[PDB]
Write a protein that binds this ligand. Sequence first.
Ligand SMILES: CCCCCCCCCCCCCCCCCC(=O)OC[C@H](COP(=O)([O-])OCC(O)COP(=O)([O-])OC[C@@H](COC(=O)CCCCCCCCCCCCCCCCC)OC(=O)CCCCCCCCCCCCCCCCC)OC(=O)CCCCCCCCCCCCCCCCC
Ligand SMILES: CCCCCCCCCCCCCCCCCC(=O)OC[C@H](COP(=O)([O-])OCC(O)COP(=O)([O-])OC[C@@H](COC(=O)CCCCCCCCCCCCCCCCC)OC(=O)CCCCCCCCCCCCCCCCC)OC(=O)CCCCCCCCCCCCCCCCC
Ligand SMILES: CCCCCCCCCCCCCCCCCC(=O)OC[C@H](COP(=O)([O-])OCC(O)COP(=O)([O-])OC[C@@H](COC(=O)CCCCCCCCCCCCCCCCC)OC(=O)CCCCCCCCCCCCCCCCC)OC(=O)CCCCCCCCCCCCCCCCC
Ligand SMILES: CCCCCCCCCCCCCCCCCC(=O)OC[C@H](COP(=O)([O-])OCC(O)COP(=O)([O-])OC[C@@H](COC(=O)CCCCCCCCCCCCCCCCC)OC(=O)CCCCCCCCCCCCCCCCC)OC(=O)CCCCCCCCCCCCCCCCC
Ligand SMILES: CCCCCCCCCCCCCCCCCC(=O)OC[C@H](COP(=O)([O-])OCC[N+](C)(C)C)OC(=O)CCCCCCCCCCCCCCCCC
Ligand SMILES: CCCCCCCCCCCCCCCCCC(=O)OC[C@H](COP(=O)([O-])OCC[N+](C)(C)C)OC(=O)CCCCCCCCCCCCCCCCC
Ligand SMILES: CCCCCCCC/C=C\CCCCCCCC(=O)O[C@H](COC(=O)CCCCCCC/C=C/CCCCCCCC)COP(=O)(O)OCCN
Ligand SMILES: CCCCCCCC/C=C\CCCCCCCC(=O)O[C@H](COC(=O)CCCCCCC/C=C/CCCCCCCC)COP(=O)(O)OCCN
Lengths: 63, 77, 62, 65, 65, 78, 78, 78, 78, 80, 129, 129
Amino acid sequence: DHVEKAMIMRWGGTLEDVRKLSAKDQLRVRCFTDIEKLYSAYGPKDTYLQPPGDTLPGKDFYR
Amino acid sequence: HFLLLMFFDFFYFIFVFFFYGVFCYWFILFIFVFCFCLLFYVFLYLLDLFAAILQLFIFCNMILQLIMDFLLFLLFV
Amino acid sequence: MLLGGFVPRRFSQFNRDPCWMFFIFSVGFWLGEYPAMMIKYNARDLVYDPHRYVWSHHDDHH
Amino acid sequence: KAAPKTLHQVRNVAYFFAAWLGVQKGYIEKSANDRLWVEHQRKVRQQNVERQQALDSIKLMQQGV
Amino acid sequence: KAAPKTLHQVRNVAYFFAAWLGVQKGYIEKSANDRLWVEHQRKVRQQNVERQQALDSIKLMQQGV
Amino acid sequence: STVAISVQGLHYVGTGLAAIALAGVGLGIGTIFGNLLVACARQPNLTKMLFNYAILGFALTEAIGLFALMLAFLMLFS
Amino acid sequence: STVAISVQGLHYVGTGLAAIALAGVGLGIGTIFGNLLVACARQPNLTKMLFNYAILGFALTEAIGLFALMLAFLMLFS
Amino acid sequence: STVAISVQGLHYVGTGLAAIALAGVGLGIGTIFGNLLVACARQPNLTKMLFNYAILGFALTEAIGLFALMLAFLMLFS
Amino acid sequence: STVAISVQGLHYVGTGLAAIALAGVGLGIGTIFGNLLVACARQPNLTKMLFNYAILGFALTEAIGLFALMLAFLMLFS
Amino acid sequence: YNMLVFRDPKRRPQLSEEERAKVVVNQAEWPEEFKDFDPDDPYKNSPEIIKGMSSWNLFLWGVECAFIYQFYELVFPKSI
Amino acid sequence: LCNAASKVQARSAKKLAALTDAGIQKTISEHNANGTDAAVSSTKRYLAEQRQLFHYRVVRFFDECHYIISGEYFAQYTKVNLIWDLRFLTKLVVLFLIGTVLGRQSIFPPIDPDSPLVEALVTKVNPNY
Amino acid sequence: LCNAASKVQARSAKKLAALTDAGIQKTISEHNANGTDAAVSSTKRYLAEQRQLFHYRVVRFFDECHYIISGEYFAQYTKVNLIWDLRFLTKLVVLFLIGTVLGRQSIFPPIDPDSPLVEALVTKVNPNY
Ligand SMILES: CCCCCCCCCCCCCCCCCC(=O)OC[C@H](COP(=O)([O-])OCC(O)COP(=O)([O-])OC[C@@H](COC(=O)CCCCCCCCCCCCCCCCC)OC(=O)CCCCCCCCCCCCCCCCC)OC(=O)CCCCCCCCCCCCCCCCC
Ligand SMILES: CCCCCCCCCCCCCCCCCC(=O)OC[C@H](COP(=O)([O-])OCC(O)COP(=O)([O-])OC[C@@H](COC(=O)CCCCCCCCCCCCCCCCC)OC(=O)CCCCCCCCCCCCCCCCC)OC(=O)CCCCCCCCCCCCCCCCC
Ligand SMILES: CCCCCCCCCCCCCCCCCC(=O)OC[C@H](COP(=O)([O-])OCC(O)COP(=O)([O-])OC[C@@H](COC(=O)CCCCCCCCCCCCCCCCC)OC(=O)CCCCCCCCCCCCCCCCC)OC(=O)CCCCCCCCCCCCCCCCC
Ligand SMILES: CCCCCCCCCCCCCCCCCC(=O)OC[C@H](COP(=O)([O-])OCC(O)COP(=O)([O-])OC[C@@H](COC(=O)CCCCCCCCCCCCCCCCC)OC(=O)CCCCCCCCCCCCCCCCC)OC(=O)CCCCCCCCCCCCCCCCC
Ligand SMILES: CCCCCCCCCCCCCCCCCC(=O)OC[C@H](COP(=O)([O-])OCC[N+](C)(C)C)OC(=O)CCCCCCCCCCCCCCCCC
Ligand SMILES: CCCCCCCCCCCCCCCCCC(=O)OC[C@H](COP(=O)([O-])OCC[N+](C)(C)C)OC(=O)CCCCCCCCCCCCCCCCC
Ligand SMILES: CCCCCCCC/C=C\CCCCCCCC(=O)O[C@H](COC(=O)CCCCCCC/C=C/CCCCCCCC)COP(=O)(O)OCCN
Ligand SMILES: CCCCCCCC/C=C\CCCCCCCC(=O)O[C@H](COC(=O)CCCCCCC/C=C/CCCCCCCC)COP(=O)(O)OCCN
């Protein structure tokens, strides 16, 4: 449930948007979620905190 | 259980993302940390096993004490 | 109560009893899942999600 | 117990030690390169932030409040 | 010559064959991805050429000969 | 005027205060063991009862130590 | 009005407060060894057994210090 | 509104709090030696043996203070 | 918004906290001498020997207080 | 001996030294499984449950199961 | 540095003397008298035997293939054979997965150019890796 | 598909019968009579011997170290020992190079960000590799 929620929220916010991706992309996303789970409170905080100047999409990307 | 979950998370993190140090020149530090983690794992499990049973001893002892506080014994003659 | 039962003297004897055979199989699974995680989650081709900053549990629970 | 006619065990240990030393050299090189790249990425992000701030300042001047 | 009580050799051959088949699957996947990337790079170069030609045409019009 | 303020770093302060409770726990353990040695010196034969009671109490003091540690983690990871 | 503030220097305070928990551990160890010396003079024939029990108590106290130190480094870095 | 603040002088408070842990260590050492003097007057023949254990407690008691002292430098110089 | 602040006066607070460590050190020294008097009245023939150990304990206990005092000077003069 | 927290039970002696010394040991009557019996390793000669199945083989089987559990999706991923 | 080496040597000597294998002890004594290495000799003997048994392996493989194909193997099928076959299947599956990983030379499938994950490749911290 | 298999089996049988090793033939006959595999048994015997000879290897290593350190090895030094030492040095060098390659996980040294070759990394045809 958590994995599916992350996939939905990070890639459009709708199930169809996630299904628009390929199986390999979904595998990549789920393995990144597993990475986050393993990191938890001792891993680097750049996995969820966007450093200033980063070119990657922000929280308002789909808004 | 909170403490157990936190310690297990730390153990998973260090074991997964820092085992390669075995092959590096700082392998001794990782070995020391791993032995420490194993010792702590064993200690935590033993402590929890003993405390789980002790807390039931005390949960039942409180009720028995309540009962005993109002019991009166007669002497046979 | 840990009173008795078959107790293998060393690793080689774990095959002398079905229950301990299952136990050593389970131990193998337990200990071998860690190297698999090391290989899988430290792979060169592993890439962080580009949209990882779009959403996170930290903002959700906050 | 006569003297050993061969030194196979010492040679095997030396082989292991040499391979290990090579591994350490490669690991040190890779770690140094990774640190250099991390610093480079940090500098790139800082430069991008400075450029964005300059653009925002120019836009503010155009606003003329 | 009694019947074989074990099938070790057949199992070893099957292990080799399974590993080989997996290798073939991975090689096919990698080759397909490489071909896709080659086509993508070719398209990118073609688009760059078209953009350069358009820019040159606009510059020619500005020249007005 | 109505003003709502949300300070982030305060959760660190509460975490440290809870850890102070361990000061009264670690010391409490030392007190039990301190008495244990004296008791064993004047009743060597009855070491079994004394050692068991020392470890029973050490768990009833460690519980309180775990009480605080849970709050520390709650205020540190949330 | 809604105001969100993030103070970057508050983890130092939390770390220091957690470090205070070691005062109990240090005193607890001192109590253990103080009793050990008294017990040894009382019944010197049992020095080894008392020494082992004192070490056991010391290890338990040190573990509590590690718990307190665990909350210190986490706050200091995190 | 989002506000990020960075206070530079807060590490002094953290350093001072960490130093407070030394009070427990100092008190623990005093207790160890106080018991040592009492114990020696009771069993003078074993004075040397008691002294070694007292030093052992100091070695195991001063070490805790170093960890608290270490945190002071990690924050004082950062 | 990013705001960086540098407070001068905080160093006084950290310095005062370090002084509190002396409370334990001062008490710890008193404990040693308190036992010394009891030990001397219990075996006066060893008064000289006991006095030597008490001085040793005072030197070790005093050393801890200096560590805290050093931090006070570092923050008080910085 | 011990295997983690599992300790091997030991039979208490019942015969006195005087009676014990008069006992004549004849291992010829003993079963083949228990000859040269050693309390520290009573199951050294015990037969295997499955012939040719070593403990290391089962350990490797478990490791392979773990590897499959972790890597199957990497080769046969499925859509949500 | 020297005391530790002496202690390790002493422990190994004690363990070596402890074993009660007549053949192992005899070989050790013979090699010590001759000054040669027993382990290396054992390795060479094993390699020679394997070199001489290659065609024996081939013949056994063909015989086993005939035994299986003839249906005689399944005639006497038992639970033990089922356990062995399950072990065999597990090894086949894990070997297939490992072979795929090695074949594509990457733990994860490669990203296609049209995939939205290409950005991740572009934003690598260290392009060399 | 079948004739080729029969021909291969016949060739292997001829070669197996050709060898004139008494021990090999005896073992083959015994295993054929018992229906077991000789090669697998040899492998298990070798592994058991190696497992039982580990501490023997340790003792031999320490003895060889003492022999070398004592200077007795160089007292009787000959040309054959020189040849062996040259072989040993070559193996050490190649192992060191291989270890370095594996340690950095790349045949070539990684490119620094300030190097002008970074463009090559940017212009990779397949970023995944
Ligand atoms: C006393 C403890 C009791 C347990 C208590 C309960 C649990 C407590 C928790 C801790 C448990 C620890 C783990 C259990 C012990 C495992 C090791 C062991 O004892 O082995 C016995 C066993 C001998 O006992 P045996 O019963 O006489 O076995 C009969 C023969 O072995 C023959 O075996 P067979 O008859 O079954 O035949 C199998 C078959 C087949 O045998 C094999 O397959 C051989 C193994 C090949 C590698 C496969 C993977 C192995 C597993 C690794 C991952 C495990 C991770 C978990 C480890 C946990 C450690 C904490 O044999 C062969 O064909 C021979 C192999 C010939 C080829 C040689 C070349 C191999 C190349 C491999 C390439 C792959 C490399 C990877 C990269 C590839 C990239 C493309 O020794 C081995 O075979 C070990 C070899 C490998 C050693 C490293 C394994 C990982 C690390 C283990 C550390 C253990 C520390 C223990 C300390 C104890 C202090 C008191
Ligand atoms: C990206 C692609 C890149 C591709 C690059 C190119 C790839 C290669 C292409 C081809 C190139 C040309 C050919 C080169 C061949 C070179 C190899 C060769 O021929 O070797 C034969 C040679 C023996 O030949 P020989 O002298 O003619 O033998 C005569 C008799 O046959 C002797 O018979 P035997 O009865 O002795 O038979 C057993 C013998 C033969 O067995 C073998 O043949 C072994 C396998 C041979 C191939 C090895 C290739 C290695 C390549 C690099 C690593 C790749 C992974 C290898 C995995 C191997 C798994 C078994 O076993 C050994 O060799 C034993 C070696 C291991 C000794 C372990 C002792 C450790 C003691 C540690 C004590 C520490 C105390 C510290 C105290 C400090 C206090 C302050 O053996 C070696 O050289 C062995 C090298 C092993 C290196 C292992 C390095 C592992 C990584 C470092 C360790 C990290 C983890 C642990 C760290 C722990 C903390 C420190
Ligand atoms: C009849 C014609 C003659 C030539 C005429 C003139 C030239 C004509 C042109 C063509 C010439 C072709 C080449 C000559 C023939 C070579 C084969 C041969 O005869 O070997 C017999 C030889 C037995 O002769 P022997 O004198 O009785 O040897 C006694 C023992 O070897 C015992 O020896 P030792 O006492 O010295 O022991 C030394 C030590 C040392 O042992 C070792 O070190 C074993 C070797 C380890 C691998 C090192 C690399 C090997 C070379 C690979 C590259 C070769 C490139 C050139 C090939 C060209 C082929 C055309 O041994 C050990 O300690 C045992 C090894 C245990 C370790 C096993 C695990 C190894 C793991 C390796 C890890 C590295 C993998 C790479 C990736 C790593 C990633 C981390 O059999 C073998 O052992 C062969 C094993 C290797 C097979 C593959 C070799 C490459 C392909 C050869 C194709 C040849 C086709 C011929 C067709 C003929 C049709 C009629
Ligand atoms: C990027 C990093 C990624 C990392 C990924 C993860 C890495 C691994 C982590 C750990 C994972 C969990 C553990 C998994 C362990 C799995 C392995 C294992 O345990 O194996 C034990 C297992 C035996 O265990 P067992 O059944 O308990 O043994 C009982 C007795 O001990 C039996 O004792 P024995 O006396 O039999 O002892 C000898 C035995 C034991 O020896 C060994 O232990 C061997 C080494 C074991 C490790 C193997 C790992 C393989 C992993 C993948 C490949 C990596 C490179 C490996 C290099 C190996 C060099 C020797 O030797 C063999 O197993 C022989 C196998 C080779 C058979 C060759 C026959 C070929 C016939 C072809 C005929 C074609 C005719 C076509 C006609 C068509 C007409 C139309 O052996 C195998 O499974 C062997 C697999 C070998 C696969 C080789 C694949 C090579 C690539 C394909 C070929 C490409 C070139 C040639 C193409 C030619 C054209 C087609
Ligand atoms: C009276 C006292 C009883 C004491 C019993 C002592 C048991 C000793 C156990 C030794 C270790 C056993 C390891 C088993 C491993 C199993 C496989 C595996 O992967 O597990 C890993 C698991 C988890 O390991 P992990 O957390 O490392 O797993 C990592 C997995 N990831 C990375 C995905 C998170 O191991 C355990 O948690 C085992 C803990 C056991 C603690 C003791 C439980 C005792 C109470 C239950 C008794 C039940 C008896 C029932 C009898 C019938 C009643 C009618
Ligand atoms: C005409 C007829 C044609 C017939 C053709 C037949 C073709 C057969 C082709 C091969 C089929 C292989 C099937 C088996 C493998 C399936 C793999 C799979 O899907 O796994 C996915 C699943 C995982 O699915 P998943 O992808 O949801 O899991 C991933 C989970 N995360 C993301 C969290 C990591 O893998 C497993 O669960 C594997 C478990 C182990 C499998 C092996 C079991 C062996 C037995 C062990 C227990 C018994 C031990 C006893 C010991 C003691 C004895 C006394
Ligand atoms: C085809 C496989 C060939 C195998 C050969 C292996 C040779 C390795 C020699 C060097 C080893 C040390 C390297 C040190 C540096 C490693 C750095 C690292 O983790 O890099 C990973 C390589 O790491 C791995 O994938 C491997 C992790 C560890 C694998 C463990 C293998 C199995 C171990 C079993 C342990 C069982 C217990 C044994 C105990 C023995 C000691 C007590 C690759 O990714 P990077 O580009 O560096 O960064 C990724 C960031 N996105
Ligand atoms: C740490 C090493 C681990 C070794 C494990 C090896 C397992 C390999 C299993 C699969 C093999 C087949 C792969 C097929 C695809 C290969 C494609 C390729 O060449 O890729 C190279 C990998 O190729 C190599 O570098 C290896 C080349 C071949 C190596 C040969 C090894 C030694 C062979 C000795 C032969 C001696 C004679 C034996 C004959 C036997 C048969 C008759 C990587 O670069 P790419 O990103 O693909 O493109 C580069 C473009 N800039």
